[PDB]
Amino acid sequence: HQTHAYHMVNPSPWPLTGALSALLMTSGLTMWFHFNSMTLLMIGLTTNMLTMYQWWRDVIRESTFQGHHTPAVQKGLRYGMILFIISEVLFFTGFFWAFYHSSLAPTPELGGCWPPTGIHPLNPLEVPLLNTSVLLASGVSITWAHHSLMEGDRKHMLQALFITITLGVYFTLLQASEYYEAPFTISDGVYGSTFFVATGFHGLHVIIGSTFLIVCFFRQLKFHFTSNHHFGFEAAAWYWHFVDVVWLFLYVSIYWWGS
Amino acid sequence: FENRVAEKQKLFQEDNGLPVHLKGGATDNILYRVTMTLCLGGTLYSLYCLGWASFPHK
Amino acid sequence: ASAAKGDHGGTGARTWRFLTFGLALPSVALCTLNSWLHSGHRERPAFIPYHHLRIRTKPFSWGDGNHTFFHNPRVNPLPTGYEK
Amino acid sequence: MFINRWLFSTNHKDIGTLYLLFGAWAGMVGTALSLLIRAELGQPGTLLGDDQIYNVVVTAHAFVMIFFMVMPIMIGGFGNWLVPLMIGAPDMAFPRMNNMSFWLLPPSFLLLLASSMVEAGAGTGWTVYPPLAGNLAHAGASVDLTIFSLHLAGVSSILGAINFITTIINMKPPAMSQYQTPLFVWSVMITAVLLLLSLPVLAAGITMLLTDRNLNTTFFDPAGGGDPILYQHLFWFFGHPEVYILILPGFGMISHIVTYYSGKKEPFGYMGMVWAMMSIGFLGFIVWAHHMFTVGMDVDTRAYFTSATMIIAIPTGVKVFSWLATLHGGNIKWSPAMMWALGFIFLFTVGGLTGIVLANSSLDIVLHDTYYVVAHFHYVLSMGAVFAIMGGFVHWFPLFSGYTLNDTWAKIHFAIMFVGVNMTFFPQHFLGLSGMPRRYSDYPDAYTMWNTISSMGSFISLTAVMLMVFIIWEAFASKREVLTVDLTTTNLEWLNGCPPPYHTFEEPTYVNLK
Amino acid sequence: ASGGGVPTDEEQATGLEREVMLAARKGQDPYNILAPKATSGTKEDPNLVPSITNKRIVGCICEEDNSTVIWFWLHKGEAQRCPSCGTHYKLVPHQLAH
Amino acid sequence: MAYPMQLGFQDATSPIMEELLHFHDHTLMIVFLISSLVLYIISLMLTTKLTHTSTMDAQEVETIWTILPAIILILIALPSLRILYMMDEINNPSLTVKTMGHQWYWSYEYTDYEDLSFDSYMIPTSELKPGELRLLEVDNRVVLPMEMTIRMLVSSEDVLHSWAVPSLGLKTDAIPGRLNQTTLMSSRPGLYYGQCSEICGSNHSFMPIVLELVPLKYFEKWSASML
Amino acid sequence: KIKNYQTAPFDSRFPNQNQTRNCWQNYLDFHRCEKAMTAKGGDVSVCEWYRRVYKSLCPISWVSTWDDRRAEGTFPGKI
Amino acid sequence: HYEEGPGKNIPFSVENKWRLLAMMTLFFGSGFAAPFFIVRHQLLKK
Amino acid sequence: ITAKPAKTPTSPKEQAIGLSVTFLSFLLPAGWVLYHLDNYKKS
Ligand SMILES: CCCCCCCCCCCCCCCCCC(=O)OCC(COC(=O)CCCCCCCCCCCCCCCCC)OC(=O)CCCCCCCCCCCCCCCCC
Ligand SMILES: CCCCCCCCCCCCCCCCCC(=O)OCC(COC(=O)CCCCCCCCCCCCCCCCC)OC(=O)CCCCCCCCCCCCCCCCC
Ligand code: HEA
Ligand code: HEA
Ligand SMILES: CCCCC/C=C\C/C=C\C/C=C\C/C=C\CCCC(=O)O[C@H](COC(=O)CCCCCCCCCCCCCCCCC)COP(=O)(O)OCCN
Ligand SMILES: CCCCCC/C=C\CCCCCCCCCC(=O)O[C@H](COC(=O)CCCCCCCCCCCCCCC)COP(=O)(O)OC[C@@H](O)CO
Ligand SMILES: CCCCCC/C=C\CCCCCCCCCC(=O)O[C@H](COC(=O)CCCCCCCCCCCCCCC)COP(=O)(O)OC[C@@H](O)CO
Numbered sequence A: 001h002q003t004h005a006y007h008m009v010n011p012s013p014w015p016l017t018g019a020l021s022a023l024l025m026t027s028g029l030t031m032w033f034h035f036n037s038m039t040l041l042m043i044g045l046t047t048n049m050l051t052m053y054q055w056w057r058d059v060i061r062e063s064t065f066q067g068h069h070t071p072a073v074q075k076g077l078r079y080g081m082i083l084f085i086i087s088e089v090l091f092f093t094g095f096f097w098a099f100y101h102s103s104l105a106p107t108p109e110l111g112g113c114w115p116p117t118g119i120h121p122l123n124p125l126e127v128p129l130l131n132t133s134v135l136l137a138s139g140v141s142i143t144w145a146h147h148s149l150m151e152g153d154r155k156h157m158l159q160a161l162f163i164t165i166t167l168g169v170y171f172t173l174l175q176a177s178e179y180y181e182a183p184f185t186i187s188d189g190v191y192g193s194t195f196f197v198a199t200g201f202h203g204l205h206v207i208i209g210s211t212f213l214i215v216c217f218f219r220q221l222k223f224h225f226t227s228n229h230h231f232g233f234e235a236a237a238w239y240w241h242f243v244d245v246v247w248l249f250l251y252v253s254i255y256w257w258g259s
Numbered sequence B: 001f002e003n004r005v006a007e008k009q010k011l012f013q014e015d016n017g018l019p020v021h022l023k024g025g026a027t028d029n030i031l032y033r034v035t036m037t038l039c040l041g042g043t044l045y046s047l048y049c050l051g052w053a054s055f056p057h058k
Numbered sequence C: 001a002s003a004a005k006g007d008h009g010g011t012g013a014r015t016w017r018f019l020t021f022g023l024a025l026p027s028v029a030l031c032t033l034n035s036w037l038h039s040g041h042r043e044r045p046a047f048i049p050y051h052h053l054r055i056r057t058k059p060f061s062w063g064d065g066n067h068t069f070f071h072n073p074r075v076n077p078l079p080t081g082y083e084k
Numbered sequence D: 001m002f003i004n005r006w007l008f009s010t011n012h013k014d015i016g017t018l019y020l021l022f023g024a025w026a027g028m029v030g031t032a033l034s035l036l037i038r039a040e041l042g043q044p045g046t047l048l049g050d051d052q053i054y055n056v057v058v059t060a061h062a063f064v065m066i067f068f069m070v071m072p073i074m075i076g077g078f079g080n081w082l083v084p085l086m087i088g089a090p091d092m093a094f095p096r097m098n099n100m101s102f103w104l105l106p107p108s109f110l111l112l113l114a115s116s117m118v119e120a121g122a123g124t125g126w127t128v129y130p131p132l133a134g135n136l137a138h139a140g141a142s143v144d145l146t147i148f149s150l151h152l153a154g155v156s157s158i159l160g161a162i163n164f165i166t167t168i169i170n171m172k173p174p175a176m177s178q179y180q181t182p183l184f185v186w187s188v189m190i191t192a193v194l195l196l197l198s199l200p201v202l203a204a205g206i207t208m209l210l211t212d213r214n215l216n217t218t219f220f221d222p223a224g225g226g227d228p229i230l231y232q233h234l235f236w237f238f239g240h241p242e243v244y245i246l247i248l249p250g251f252g253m254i255s256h257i258v259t260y261y262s263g264k265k266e267p268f269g270y271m272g273m274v275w276a277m278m279s280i281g282f283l284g285f286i287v288w289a290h291h292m293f294t295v296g297m298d299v300d301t302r303a304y305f306t307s308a309t310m311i312i313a314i315p316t317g318v319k320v321f322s323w324l325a326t327l328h329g330g331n332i333k334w335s336p337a338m339m340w341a342l343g344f345i346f347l348f349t350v351g352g353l354t355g356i357v358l359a360n361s362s363l364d365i366v367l368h369d370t371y372y373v374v375a376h377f378h379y380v381l382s383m384g385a386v387f388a389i390m391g392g393f394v395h396w397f398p399l400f401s402g403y404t405l406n407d408t409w410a411k412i413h414f415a416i417m418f419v420g421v422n423m424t425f426f427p428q429h430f431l432g433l434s435g436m437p438r439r440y441s442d443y444p445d446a447y448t449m450w451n452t453i454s455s456m457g458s459f460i461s462l463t464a465v466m467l468m469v470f471i472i473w474e475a476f477a478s479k480r481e482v483l484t485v486d487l488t489t490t491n492l493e494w495l496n497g498c499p500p501p502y503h504t505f506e507e508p509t510y511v512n513l514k
Numbered sequence E: 001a002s003g004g005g006v007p008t009d010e011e012q013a014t015g016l017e018r019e020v021m022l023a024a025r026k027g028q029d030p031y032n033i034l035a036p037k038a039t040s041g042t043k044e045d046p047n048l049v050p051s052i053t054n055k056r057i058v059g060c061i062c063e064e065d066n067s068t069v070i071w072f073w074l075h076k077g078e079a080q081r082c083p084s085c086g087t088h089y090k091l092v093p094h095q096l097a098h
Numbered sequence F: 001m002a003y004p005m006q007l008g009f010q011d012a013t014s015p016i017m018e019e020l021l022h023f024h025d026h027t028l029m030i031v032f033l034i035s036s037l038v039l040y041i042i043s044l045m046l047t048t049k050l051t052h053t054s055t056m057d058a059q060e061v062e063t064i065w066t067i068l069p070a071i072i073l074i075l076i077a078l079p080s081l082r083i084l085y086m087m088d089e090i091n092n093p094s095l096t097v098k099t100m101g102h103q104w105y106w107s108y109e110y111t112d113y114e115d116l117s118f119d120s121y122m123i124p125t126s127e128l129k130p131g132e133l134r135l136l137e138v139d140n141r142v143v144l145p146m147e148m149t150i151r152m153l154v155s156s157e158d159v160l161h162s163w164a165v166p167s168l169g170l171k172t173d174a175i176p177g178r179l180n181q182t183t184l185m186s187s188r189p190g191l192y193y194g195q196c197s198e199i200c201g202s203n204h205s206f207m208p209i210v211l212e213l214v215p216l217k218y219f220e221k222w223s224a225s226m227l
Numbered sequence G: 001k002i003k004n005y006q007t008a009p010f011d012s013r014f015p016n017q018n019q020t021r022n023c024w025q026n027y028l029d030f031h032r033c034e035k036a037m038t039a040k041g042g043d044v045s046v047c048e049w050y051r052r053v054y055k056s057l058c059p060i061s062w063v064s065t066w067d068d069r070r071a072e073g074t075f076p077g078k079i
Numbered sequence H: 001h002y003e004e005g006p007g008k009n010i011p012f013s014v015e016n017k018w019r020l021l022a023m024m025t026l027f028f029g030s031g032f033a034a035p036f037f038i039v040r041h042q043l044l045k046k
Numbered sequence I: 001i002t003a004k005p006a007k008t009p010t011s012p013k014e015q016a017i018g019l020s021v022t023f024l025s026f027l028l029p030a031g032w033v034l035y036h037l038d039n040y041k042k043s
């Protein structure tokens, strides 16, 4: 019988499966790029999906059903999530650095100018503007979600959380449509590479963010959250704002300053 | 929807010596088994592919 | 641009709902509106075979390895020119 | 009761043990790769005949030692074993995630070994600069497998870093401030912070190379308006923090060994030691372009980077002098651990000072990409990082295993290793100054003498390594269990016995506030 | 206006979380979340160290802003003294259940 | 070039390399001071049975071992930086030569007046004439006028290379798409050798560089003779 | 005349190691000059300066490649 | 609960010192050997 | 660090074999490969 408040975790296979999924996804991407085939890739994604589901399930079991998230454990979770976001900020920094390296000193092969010759950039006042409003409006609704939750208001929490999600989906679809309509491609030199990798990786974070908010929505439906203890929601909110902010920076850098 | 958390609490606080990842009944056991089989299958298979890819032919 | 309205001495979810419905969503409506009255289908850009564009160092790993993933025949040419 | 223990662990000690096991093995691979390098250079002409295989060997030598030997032993092994014991924590903050950090490394290693099996391997250097690493000068899967090895290794360390930082901040006795934690802990936390910030940038840069190789991006390709120099910035922005990541936990171990074997109850200048690690930590992020003094940057930029690099000398010196002040007035015990520590202090300083020479962008024109650099870094790594591991290993072995080593043998081991590494690397300074490039399978005739002596040193160090395997066998063969340990009052990690229970601090420590 | 429907912690916290919460409100610290307040530490007024078992590690911060904690096992029986500063510690029972 | 059993730098053929020799002596002097001081202090700490194991007060003595290192670095940094700006500075060069890296050989271009240009390949081992240096000799050498400021532009048509000539104090990476400048001044006629200083794959060891410094007159006639 | 010539002098516009743009700008300047003088009936010899400078500093394969592209109508610079 | 104490907190047995000697030689030897075989592999291959 | 008496002392005899086995595991495999290395420039 422990007399400290931390959480001694039941031995678990998920770390091994996660690790092995990573072998299969990576091996797979390599088979796919070279010995044309998506077999390993597919098994990997499946094992990965299976691993994530069960790991996070056990965390909900450990916390909501078993009562292991004492205030000490909650405090550690806040720190871990903040540190993760910092990691992600630094990942994106690389892509920005790439953008600015190329656009501040355009090479002669591009015509010695930015945008490069032959590139027809999108209008930042058309759909990119819309996308900005959509994510910003997102930040307002997720915040209303959080205060409603803390005041004990179930129907409004869910109401606001649904609006937030819809906006995430609206963004995704607008960006998907923009990808299709764009008159330049990832292959169109350095302009295209920076545009689609930076926005692309962002697009991926929008989906991860939304998926995470969908998880919070269902968990809220099932009454997991209390008015004081709801760390999964907070983490999802922070991740969401982080996603908002990177967009603001892509918008100002790539779409506006770089057209 | 109805608030069924107290029941899930009892089920998962049951003194039965089962680790958290199997403590929900046999569904868990099927998913554990599926996931591992897939992992070990895929891992072996991925070693097989390192096999062929190593050579043009000995 | 620099804000301008007010609140704090009585607040809550109510205030944030108020901003969602009275400011944020209306902005999205307006911005949607600006877009619907704008996107004048861009004249297909003239194809020039610029060496810095349509880069093919290794074929893509799908289709015929010459088509980008969200290829649009209407606006995206191949290296040899427009398909259709 | 074996699968549930060694494969599904949620326990810091067992995860530590696994990490040491993994590292031990990797070390053999790396050592073997180094002998193959010096075999090729042990006399003029060619031994392997194929020079793409030499380049493959050099490249894998570096990856195995850095990512697979040093980092997992120091951070993964010592870090997991010691940090919680040193702060009275019941485990790490994220036990299950901790296990994933380990289990990612064998897959990571598999993918690197596989890189050298398939095609003609990755003969790039450990820098992996484009265009050589591009899909034309290195067509095929080799480089892609390397990239993926690093992605996995990278993820392992980031998740590890989050755990260490969270653990060290959140799980100390409620009365203990950060300024009452031992230096080894301080050293892991700071290292963890550098991992957190530096690896993501590497992950971006190699992801950009990956898309350049397989999705027709032109980040690094001038054809598309790319710049191969953008790669260097991104690599080295990581790469420099990485060298400080390799040595910092080393610094923390030396601090404890010097203090223990001098009979001091604490090191000299605790707060200066803390300050210096933070300063090295911070300055480590604004020096990266000293690996790029020959690529054609502005003279004003090169002046900044020379100057900024020099400043690291100042807090590093404060450490060296504080270890020495720790010896002052010590009841010095000449255990093998202490011999390792003393060698560290001298040899590190030498590698450090050749670093200072290189920091001069003037002089680096003629020294860059010569064996002078190889010497610098094999002094701070092969005799700095490795000596602290050895020393740490010998000192805490009884705590991990519950059995003692034979000290006489351990001293023999030290004596052989000392002669080997110095014989191997010392003459490389002359090579460099005389102008022998690095990454050569063969050399003008003039360089024959120093290359001959150097390769002979390899074998001395090999003998040293063979003996260490034996030394560990003997320990476990003879089973001399630990009776008493001294100085337990200021070394909490020894206070639950050797080895300690699977669960330590189930009831936490009692520390008054006052 | 609003309406309710969100459970509180009083309603739905379980396990160790619930125990810590209940204890907190009676002003007790069975799970060692707070730092204990020292006594004068003399032979007559020793520091009382709760344990569930027959011994417990004491770290003693002899003076404020010492960077080095003095650690020692404290055993059931006579009050023991910090090896470094002499301040007294006596072990006691109550961290216990029924 | 390097002679056998060599311990330091090759002899300086340019004034800028001469500068670096003295700067290295100046610096290595400081390295020997600090490394010897440390060894002495180490051996000092270890050779007495007298003890003081109670705690010691620190910050007073730490001033010294912070301020003094700082002074020493200023003594290194100042000359170091004087030379760097000297290497960079305004040239008034009388001639511009280009060199282009390739896997695995160098090409050269003299295009101030006429489009003169040639490859340059390591003489292999089997084909070496007697007294010719294994791994260093080329078919066509880079003939240039001694006693004159020359602009070298370095670049590459494939991967990274680096064009080094140690005895002249020269090393400039060769990057495709980029044109890197270094200046070149030989105090003496002669042959001077370097080798490629970035890892360009298999034959990285075997793309040497050979300057042939001769007077203006013979260089002119050599240029006329090569077209 | 202010001309007869050894090589391209120091140009304060391009004072660092990287001389990529000195090659480029002089190639551009030359052809922009040649265009406007071939079009408007005035001696093309006023443009010689830029030709010498760019011939001197530009790699042969750069000049060669850019000349091909100008003839192909894919030269990315605005002449 | 798991095995506690000296020789019991490891994923290998030390109960017999010669099974140990062999385990240790396979383990460290395989590690040491791998690069030589990778080189052989590469030398043959083509 | 004081130990207890070796519960299973390892005689100089035993040690000689230990050291021999251990050196042989490192040296034989490498030696085989290295001996046969001029034979590998062929295929
Ligand atoms: C350092 C690690 C210790 C362990 C060493 C084990 C191995 C034994 C090494 C023997 C014992 C170690 C001491 C030898 C130092 C040799 C310095 C030197 O020859 O300097 C000459 C220069 C410059 O070269 C020239 O301009 C030409 C020289 C012109 C003079 C006439 C030459 C006549 C030929 C002489 C041939 C005999 C020398 C051959 C020497 C052959 C050596 C293999 O070379 C260089 O740049 C070398 C740059 C390397 C700098 C690394 C810093 C390490 C400091 C070590 C502590 C020292 C403090 C005392 C403290 C002393 C206590 C150690
Ligand atoms: C083989 C031995 C099996 C072991 C059986 C045990 C029997 C009893 C159980 C009795 C209990 C009953 C159950 C019996 C089942 C035994 C299962 C087993 O054998 O379990 C296996 C376990 C245990 O590991 C071992 O296999 C033991 C190794 C030998 C021990 C050495 C002694 C320690 C050396 C000193 C280390 C320093 C730290 C020490 C101090 C640490 C503090 C204590 O594996 C691990 O969990 C971790 C190993 C990680 C390291 C591997 C590197 C992977 C690289 C991948 C790339 C390859 C590509 C090649 C490609 C090639 C290209 C050509
Ligand atoms: C930690 C990093 C590390 C370590 C330990 C080493 C160790 C050794 N290295 Fe290496 N090396 C590099 C990092 C390292 N090196 C890097 C980054 C490069 C550049 C690659 C490139 O150019 O791209 C390089 C390149 C390099 C070169 C230049 C290659 C070239 O330019 O062509 C040479 C030449 O001799 C060399 C030799 C050696 C030798 C003889 C040893 C050793 O043999 C010395 C003896 C040390 C040991 C044998 C290790 C002992 C420790 C253990 C066995 C662990 C024990 C485990 C426990 C106790 C738990 N290495
Ligand atoms: C543990 C690893 C490690 C550490 C700690 C260091 C530490 C330092 N290194 Fe090094 N280094 C490498 C590993 C390391 N390095 C590797 C692997 C490479 C090669 C990368 C590659 O190309 O593959 C490299 C390359 C490298 C270069 C690139 C050179 C080139 O390629 O041309 C430079 C340039 O400045 C450099 C400088 C330094 C400096 C100034 C320090 C300082 O941190 C040293 C500080 C220490 C001291 C100065 C001694 C102690 C101080 C005192 C006793 C106080 C008094 C001192 C004075 C007054 C001067 N090192
Ligand atoms: C519903 C859509 C919403 C918005 C976008 C959301 C998701 C995009 C898809 C995947 C996101 C994942 C990774 C990002 C990686 C690469 C950038 C891809 C971004 C993208 O989607 O770019 C598009 C497709 O890109 C291409 O060709 C190639 C695209 C396919 C590449 C396959 C995946 C490649 C794997 C590389 C990354 C793996 C390594 C990750 C490193 C992490 C380490 C921690 C560009 O379309 P295009 O036809 O060129 O131009 C449009 C012309 N009208
Ligand atoms: C290559 C393409 C493949 C991409 C695949 C990825 C796809 C989708 C990912 C979707 C993310 C889902 C995250 C769900 C986490 C649910 C578990 C949870 O939320 O757990 C919470 C704890 O926090 C916690 O662990 C918080 C744990 C949060 C971690 C979330 C971070 C996920 C980000 C993934 C990053 C991928 C990035 C890759 C590209 C760089 C539980 O505590 P509470 O909430 O307080 O409950 C307790 C109360 O009920 C009691 O009174
Ligand atoms: C493209 C090809 C390469 C692919 C490489 C991808 C590598 C691996 C993918 C497989 C991983 C999927 C499953 C991971 C699940 C995360 C677990 C998690 O959520 O970790 C949590 C802690 O970390 C926290 O909060 C902080 C939350 C951290 C969660 C992050 C998990 C994913 C990280 C991968 C991405 C890193 C990228 C960062 C740099 C860009 C929970 O901690 P546990 O210790 O488990 O339990 C603690 C208990 O008290 C809970 O009650």
Ligand SMILES: CCCCCC/C=C\CCCCCCCCCC(=O)O[C@H](COC(=O)CCCCCCCCCCCCCCC)COP(=O)(O)OC[C@@H](O)CO
Residues within 6 Å of the ligand: D406, D408, D409, D480, I003, I004, I005, I006, I011, I012, I015, I016, I019, I020, I023
């Ligand atoms: C034919 C003639 C050749 C001779 C040349 C030999 C030259 C050099 C070999 C060097 C050997 C010296 C090793 C000394 C290490 C032991 C010294 C020591 O100090 O250990 C001793 C024990 O070892 C003991 O029997 C003594 C152990 C000695 C065993 C020596 C075996 C080495 C054999 C080498 C063979 C090479 C073969 C190579 C072939 C490939 C004494 O300690 P204890 O009383 O147990 O402690 C008491 C307490 O602490 C217990 O808790």
Ligand SMILES: CCCCCCCCCCO[C@@H]1O[C@H](CO)[C@@H](O[C@H]2O[C@H](CO)[C@@H](O)[C@H](O)[C@H]2O)[C@H](O)[C@H]1O
Residues within 6 Å of the ligand: A036, A037, A038, A039, C061, C062, C063, C069
């Ligand atoms: C990616 C789908 C996205 C939908 C959007 C529409 C845009 C057009 C993309 C078409 O993508 C197809 O996907 C297939 C996946 O089944 C590929 O099969 C490829 O991979 C298989 C792996 O099993 C092999 O069997 C096949 O030979 C090989 O053509 C195939 O090349 C490709 O045409």
Ligand SMILES: CCCCCCCCCCO[C@@H]1O[C@H](CO)[C@@H](O[C@H]2O[C@H](CO)[C@@H](O)[C@H](O)[C@H]2O)[C@H](O)[C@H]1O
Residues within 6 Å of the ligand: D035, D462, I027, I028, I029, I030, I031, I032, I033, I034, I035
């Ligand atoms: C890191 C570098 C280590 C360097 C190597 C260490 C020193 C050598 C250890 C012994 O290795 C053996 O050497 C024999 C050579 O004497 C080889 O026999 C070979 O040659 C002999 C003929 O002389 C025959 O006995 C054998 O059949 C034939 O395989 C044999 O394969 C090999 O195991």
Ligand SMILES: C[C@H](CCC(=O)O)[C@H]1CC[C@H]2[C@@H]3[C@H](O)C[C@@H]4C[C@H](O)CC[C@]4(C)[C@H]3C[C@H](O)[C@]12C
Residues within 6 Å of the ligand: A154, A155, A158, A159, A162, B001, B002
């Ligand atoms: C069913 C549930 C109330 C159940 C309960 O009290 O437990 C209510 C509360 C809030 C509702 C949601 C929110 O009002 C937001 C959406 C409102 C739209 O008008 C319908 C769908 C919509 C997504 C609703 C679905 C569902 O009716 C919810 C989730």
Ligand SMILES: C[C@H](CCC(=O)O)[C@H]1CC[C@H]2[C@@H]3[C@H](O)C[C@@H]4C[C@H](O)CC[C@]4(C)[C@H]3C[C@H](O)[C@]12C
Residues within 6 Å of the ligand: B032, B033, B036, B037, B040, D003
């Ligand atoms: C408990 C153990 C896990 C072992 C491990 O992860 O290494 C079990 C759980 C499920 C098992 C697997 C599943 O039963 C299904 C597979 C088919 C047969 O049942 C035997 C082999 C088979 C491949 C099994 C291997 C192994 O016995 C597994 C993976």
Ligand SMILES: C[C@H](CCC(=O)O)[C@H]1CC[C@H]2[C@@H]3[C@H](O)C[C@@H]4C[C@H](O)CC[C@]4(C)[C@H]3C[C@H](O)[C@]12C
Residues within 6 Å of the ligand: A101, D230, D233, D289, D300, D301, D304
């Ligand atoms: C090297 C780096 C990245 C450039 C690139 O990606 O091409 C550039 C970007 C901003 C630069 C810095 C800023 O211009 C500010 C400083 C300017 C000084 O003249 C040199 C130091 C100085 C601190 C610069 C050093 C270096 O040139 C930096 C750091």
Ligand SMILES: C[C@H](CCC(=O)O)[C@H]1CC[C@H]2[C@@H]3[C@H](O)C[C@@H]4C[C@H](O)CC[C@]4(C)[C@H]3C[C@H](O)[C@]12C
Residues within 6 Å of the ligand: D271, D272, D275, D318, F059, F060, F062, F063, F064, F066
């Ligand atoms: C003030 C602070 C912490 C004191 C404490 O709270 O215990 C100490 C610890 C390390 C100190 C620094 C280091 O001792 C190194 C420097 C030494 C010089 O004597 C003063 C500046 C100097 C930069 C110090 C300033 C200051 O006294 C520091 C920063």
Ligand code: CUA
Residues within 6 Å of the ligand: F101, F102, F103, F104, F160, F161, F162, F196, F197, F198, F199, F200, F201, F203, F204, F205, F207
């Ligand atoms: Cu060209 Cu090395």
Ligand SMILES: [Cu+2]
Residues within 6 Å of the ligand: D239, D240, D243, D287, D288, D290, D291
């Ligand atoms: Cu650095």
Ligand SMILES: [Mg+2]
Residues within 6 Å of the ligand: D294, D368, D369, F162, F173, F197, F198
């Ligand atoms: Mg270089």
Ligand code: NA
Residues within 6 Å of the ligand: D040, D041, D042, D043, D044, D045, D046, D047, D441, D442, D443
């Ligand atoms: Na050789």
Ligand SMILES: [Zn+2]
Residues within 6 Å of the ligand: E060, E061, E062, E070, E082, E083, E084, E085, E086, E087
């Ligand atoms: Zn005390």
